Amino acid sequence: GIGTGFPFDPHYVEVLGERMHYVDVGPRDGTPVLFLHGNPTSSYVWRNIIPHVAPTHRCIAPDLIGMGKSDKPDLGYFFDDHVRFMDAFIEALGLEEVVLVIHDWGSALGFHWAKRNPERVKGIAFMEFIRPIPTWDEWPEFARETFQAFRTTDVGRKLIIDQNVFIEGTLPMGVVRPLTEVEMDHYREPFLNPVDREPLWRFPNELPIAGEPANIVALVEEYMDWLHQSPVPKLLFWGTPGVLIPPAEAARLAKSLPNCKAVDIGPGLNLLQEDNPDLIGSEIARWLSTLEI
Numbered sequence: 001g002i003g004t005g006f007p008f009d010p011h012y013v014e015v016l017g018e019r020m021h022y023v024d025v026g027p028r029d030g031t032p033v034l035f036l037h038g039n040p041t042s043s044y045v046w047r048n049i050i051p052h053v054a055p056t057h058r059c060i061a062p063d064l065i066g067m068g069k070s071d072k073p074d075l076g077y078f079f080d081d082h083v084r085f086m087d088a089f090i091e092a093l094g095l096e097e098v099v100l101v102i103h104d105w106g107s108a109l110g111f112h113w114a115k116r117n118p119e120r121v122k123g124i125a126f127m128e129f130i131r132p133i134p135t136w137d138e139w140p141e142f143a144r145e146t147f148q149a150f151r152t153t154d155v156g157r158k159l160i161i162d163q164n165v166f167i168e169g170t171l172p173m174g175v176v177r178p179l180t181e182v183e184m185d186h187y188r189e190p191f192l193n194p195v196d197r198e199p200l201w202r203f204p205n206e207l208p209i210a211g212e213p214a215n216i217v218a219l220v221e222e223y224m225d226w227l228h229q230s231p232v233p234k235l236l237f238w239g240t241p242g243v244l245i246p247p248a249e250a251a252r253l254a255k256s257l258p259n260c261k262a263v264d265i266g267p268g269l270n271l272l273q274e275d276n277p278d279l280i281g282s283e284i285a286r287w288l289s290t291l292e293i
């Protein structure tokens with residue numbers, strides 16, 4: 001079956017005065033592989049991919065601030081806040097060069113960090129990643145009405161904060177196969193207290209859709225432009241129908257991105273890791289063996 005356990009010893013590091021939790025497994029030397037989750041997940045989303053990689057490479061998987069087992073400061077939980085904390089996490093572990101494996105808002109962090117630190121990125125594997133969505137028509141039809149509602153202060157907070165819709169509704173709708181209760185309970189655990197749900201609401205309000213917020217559109221356009229001019233090895237996983245990255249978009253990127261291999265993981269929405277962890281993990285391990293690391 002698909003594993004439901006999380007058999008990783010907890011590690012913590014102090015970051016801007018807060019403790020951040022992270023997985024750290026695999027060999028001690030070499031180039032580490034840094035796995036960045038997004039909304040509304042945690043390092044749990046990588047639990048069945050890490051074991052394919054850990055035999056050959058160090059795997060580091062932090063929980064974003066306010067998420068997973070990381071601390072919950074008083075924060076806006078803006079993308080800008082996550083940039084400060086992730087920048088500081090990477091320096092607090094003393095990382096030098098890395099390979100990135102990134103998803104959803106973790107991909108916006110990873111691509112933005114790579115743009116600003118290009119000499120330190122030896123490869124990027126990515127899936128269901130943040131790109132500009134120029135109009136609402138380019139958001140999947142089945143999810144337009146809900147994300148339009150999320151992007152309000154009254155109805156959106158009632159849904160996501162009061163009723164925990166991103167965890168109880170949106171997350172399962174991002175997986176083709178049924179999630180089981182152990183898996184849901186791991187995703188629920190950081191958010192049992194409603195007042196701890198601000199990241200889950202601020203994130204969809206940061207998504208670059210139909211030109212807003214314009215600062216996030218600008219930041220994401222910048223790292224997409226960087227990506228298209230970078231020789232860094234790239235590995236793109238995509239599913240059908242997808243959510244952020246539909247098949248036609250994956251095919252465009254497979255053509256336009258330098259040094260990019262694309263892999264079709266079969267049926268998939270947003271949390272591709274939950275529908276096909278073994279192909280994602282085995283293809284990352286293979287690709288790592290071809291990098292000059």
Ligand SMILES: *CCCCCCOCCOCCNC(=O)CCCCC[N+]1=C(/C=C/C=C2/N(C)c3ccccc3C2(C)C)C(C)(C)c2ccccc21
Nearest residue numbers: 039104105143145146149159163165168169170173174270
């Ligand atoms: C970085 C991107 C991450 C993507 C994650 C995966 O995304 C998958 C695509 O999105 C799926 C979107 N659909 C859903 O989330 C389905 C669940 C919707 C909420 C259903 N629901 C409730 C509904 C309350 C009422 C609503 N109102 C008034 C309204 C108005 C406009 C649009 C939509 C809506 C909804 C949200 C339907 C309650 C009863 C609160 C509830 C309780 C528990 C679970 C689900 C729901």
Ligand SMILES: [Cl-]
Nearest residue numbers: 039203204207
């Ligand atoms: Cl989101």
Ligand SMILES: [Mg+2]
Nearest residue numbers: 017018073074
């Ligand atoms: Mg504090």
